[PDB]
Amino acid sequence: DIAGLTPCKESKQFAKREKQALKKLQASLKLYADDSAPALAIKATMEKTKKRFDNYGKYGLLCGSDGLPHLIVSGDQRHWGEFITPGILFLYIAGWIGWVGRSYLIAIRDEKKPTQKEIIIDVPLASSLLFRGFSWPVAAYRELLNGELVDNNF
Amino acid sequence: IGPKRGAKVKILRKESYWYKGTGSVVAVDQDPNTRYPVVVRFNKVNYANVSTNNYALDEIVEVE
Amino acid sequence: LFFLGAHFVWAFSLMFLFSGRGYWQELIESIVWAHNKLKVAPATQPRALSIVQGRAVGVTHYLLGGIATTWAFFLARIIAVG
Amino acid sequence: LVDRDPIKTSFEQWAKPGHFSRTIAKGPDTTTWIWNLHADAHDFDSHTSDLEEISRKVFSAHFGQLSIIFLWLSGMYFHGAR
Amino acid sequence: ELDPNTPSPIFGGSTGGLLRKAQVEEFYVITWDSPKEQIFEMPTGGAAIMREGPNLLKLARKEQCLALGTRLRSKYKIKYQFYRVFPNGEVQYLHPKDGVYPEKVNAGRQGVGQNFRSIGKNVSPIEVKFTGKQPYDL
Amino acid sequence: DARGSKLMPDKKDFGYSFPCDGPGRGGTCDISAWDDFYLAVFWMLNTIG
Amino acid sequence: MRDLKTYLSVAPVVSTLWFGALAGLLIEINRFFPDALIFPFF
Amino acid sequence: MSHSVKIYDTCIGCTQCVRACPTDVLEMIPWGGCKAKQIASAPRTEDCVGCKRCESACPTDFLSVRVYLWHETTRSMGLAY
């Protein structure tokens, strides 16, 4: 809707892309597997990109010209989860990479000398620490701002 | 013992590789006499193969 | 699809070939600072490249760059006509 | 070095912080050494003053390669057959 | 150079050693003790046997004598001398002068160390922009 | 830090173009504010491209 | 055999059994959903 | 300056510490004690080239040392010749 022309429901330019291209990759008249059991353009690789179809999902999806899709990601119409849905996802996953970065680290410096523990890795992935990360509700999001890492630790 | 000699000292000349990072003291001088007493140590190494280096009472400043 | 990378890797070598060393130090600390604030760095004193290592990461890249560039350039003008 | 010399450990050393040139890797931590050691994993200034073995090592490293070509190229000859 | 051979120290020929501006400036020969005749490394790609003495070969530039010196005290002895020759004899007399073996005291000579101020905070910039009133010339 | 840092505390009274320093410390090089200017001019020749 | 407050070690590159694999199981989500570019939810 | 690269430190002790350098350094001056009490940055320096072999070993604990004279001899060069 926002400029790049509209979704699947009609994107001719998009249609023409579906067709030539793949459909021709077809257009090797045959090359022969009349029984034959191996060679897989034939089945899917097309059909897996091809039984892509007046359906794709549906997905809206903007299709500029040449009918390749453009992603607006505004908070509108159809398009919201082309950044946020897979955006908070990126955030959540990272940060539970480094929440445990700031963990199978702040667990040593200690006892009897710890000068390169780090290059062998008891327990690997920390693991133990690991799950801390999904079991963050809130986690750093208040504790980083108060106490522990605290302005004094600042 | 009963005042303190080498508990823990910050450093503040602002050349010292360690600078602020505050680590290790050692047999700090029993004189009235000079101007570069105090050994100190910490594990954060430094730019040369060996660093633990000696620092003097100016200023040198806190802990506190 | 290689001919762009490796025609990239080469044009990454110069960075390793053409540059100082206490530079990426001087930089590596600004880093190391930001690191300490959150409490996330010191252990295993992160250090810049060993003058001659830097040269080791020139050269070696300048070659596997500048070379496979043609390994691509070639196999692409004998396969198909010729 | 002495984890424990000669006569009286079968027991292998994995651990306590490990080796080269005598103010050996410090104890206290660094990065460079992880780059050292892949490099100049063999130079032969070090390991022993006396050639002693090394010729007794370079025959073995040679064996590894001959195998490997072989691992190779079975692979190749496979691939080529099936 | 036949009519006088003074020589003590024994090469044969090389491409190496001094070419013309040793004559036109400053000369630089080194001399030494020896026991029983040994075969040596050089400056300049290599090598020779010594015997005795003066044991007084001459070198190009000062880095080269001292350079043996390291050379000369592995395989040992105490005694190595290095003098600097002009054309026209003396001033600047190089190893002779007091003691040798730096790492001893009789005296100071030299050196200071500090200029005007000590290592601490020259965060402070350079100052007044060169005028011939104020102690910036040492 | 043309005035300079840790790897060089000193690095001054020629601030600008003193290019190079001895090997050792970590190994020290194009760490004059000129040689960062020197290094800068490649990206001003890459943006402006 | 491992209880409470950190455990046993591991080598230099077990990252090469962590790049290869784990990460590897992910192509395994990129053929189960042979595709993306947005995604339905559950 | 005409050779001015500060290697000074504080111990200026020179045992298992530093010696290396073509002529330039006679030190062992003492100064009225420092433990080992051989002090100073230097002896008279109008003789040799510009190494930083000068630290590489035995502390300077601020700056490394380096090229810098500028004002440059030939004998201080290596080449005239």
Ligand code: CLA
């Ligand atoms: C970070 C930097 C910035 C960026 C993004 C680039 C990017 C590029 N420079 Mg460049 N450059 C820069 C700064 C930059 N430069 C600076 C400051 C200078 C100095 C002034 C230069 C000097 C320079 C020169 C002289 C050249 C370049 C060139 C290039 C391009 C190579 C073509 C290409 O990559 O196709 C993009 C497509 C791909 C990379 C497809 C990748 C698919 C393959 C590799 C497989 C997937 C990746 C996989 C991990 C690889 C397999 C490895 C496996 C074993 C793990 C690339 C666009 C070269 C060029 O091509 O023309 C100028 C040229 O040589 N640059």
Ligand code: CLA
């Ligand atoms: C897991 C991470 C750990 C953490 C918490 C951080 C955090 C940070 N890094 Mg960083 N970094 C790391 C490892 C880490 N780094 C490593 C290993 C390197 C390679 C030298 C770097 C190189 C680096 C540079 C050059 C910069 C930062 C910067 C930053 C800061 C900006 C965030 C950013 O955009 O960089 C994104 C993070 C990276 C590019 C690091 C990639 C390495 C990650 C993936 C390590 C993954 C975990 C690792 C496998 C540990 C093993 C787990 C163990 C518990 C078993 C941020 C404070 C920037 C800064 O100084 O500004 C404040 C600066 O740009 N980092």
Ligand code: CLA
């Ligand atoms: C803006 C960008 C730019 C840049 C920076 C480059 C850079 C490069 N291209 Mg390239 N290229 C470009 C645009 C660019 N290209 C464009 C628009 C095209 C058209 C598609 C190409 C097509 C292309 C091809 C086909 C090839 C490269 C190759 C290369 C690489 C060879 C250069 C080298 O490292 O050795 C320097 C190279 C030489 C000194 C020899 C090349 C000079 C030749 C042309 C004639 C001189 C030979 C003559 C008989 C006398 C010899 C003198 C002798 C002393 C050298 C280099 C990475 C190639 C490669 O892999 O090279 C090894 C491969 O050949 N390019």
Ligand code: CLA
């Ligand atoms: C028949 C001989 C052969 C053998 C047995 C050796 C043996 C040796 N060489 Mg040597 N060398 C050879 C041929 C050989 N060389 C050739 C042809 C050259 C010219 C290039 C050299 C140039 C050379 C140098 C400059 C040095 C040695 C050194 C050494 C010693 C150190 C070995 C080491 O640590 O591995 C070193 C190997 C690594 C650290 C692995 C890194 C390899 C990188 C560069 C990857 C290469 C690019 C490749 C495309 C990457 C894989 C793909 C990737 C993109 C996925 C060792 C005694 C070193 C020494 O100090 O002597 C005691 C010194 O470094 N060699």
Ligand SMILES: CC1=C(/C=C/C(C)=C/C=C/C(C)=C\C=C\C=C(C)\C=C\C=C(C)\C=C\C2=C(C)CCCC2(C)C)C(C)(C)CCC1
């Ligand atoms: C809505 C939206 C938007 C907006 C934006 C903005 C407005 C911006 C900003 C932002 C910002 C303003 C940022 C900053 C902040 C601050 C801070 C300060 C942060 C922080 C943090 C930290 C510190 C972290 C840490 C960590 C973690 C958490 C993980 C692990 C560990 C670590 C350390 C890594 C965008 C654009 C996106 C686009 C569209 C959508």
Ligand SMILES: CC1=C(/C=C/C(C)=C/C=C\C(C)=C\C=C\C=C(C)/C=C/C=C(C)/C=C/C2=C(C)CCCC2(C)C)C(C)(C)CCC1
């Ligand atoms: C985002 C991200 C990322 C990134 C990626 C990229 C961006 C890339 C690239 C890359 C490029 C851009 C380039 C590269 C290239 C590479 C290469 C290239 C390698 C290799 C090689 C080879 C194997 C070779 C071989 C050969 C031989 C045999 C010899 C010579 C020739 C040749 C070269 C052929 C990743 C995912 C990673 C991680 C995460 C994050």
Ligand SMILES: CC1=C(C/C=C(\C)CCC[C@H](C)CCC[C@@H](C)CCCC(C)C)C(=O)c2ccccc2C1=O
């Ligand atoms: C760019 C550059 C650098 C900076 C380059 C650096 C610091 C490269 C080193 C980066 C390492 C390889 C990152 C290692 C971190 C990861 C291996 C750790 C996490 C492990 C993973 C699972 C990601 C130099 O040090 C240098 C030195 C001498 C001459 C020229 C140059 C030069 O040009």
Ligand code: SF4
């Ligand atoms: S090198 Fe430094 S510490 Fe060593 S003697 Fe000289 S001044 Fe003293």
Ligand code: SF4
């Ligand atoms: S290299 Fe430096 S320290 Fe050594 S003699 Fe020369 S100027 Fe002096």
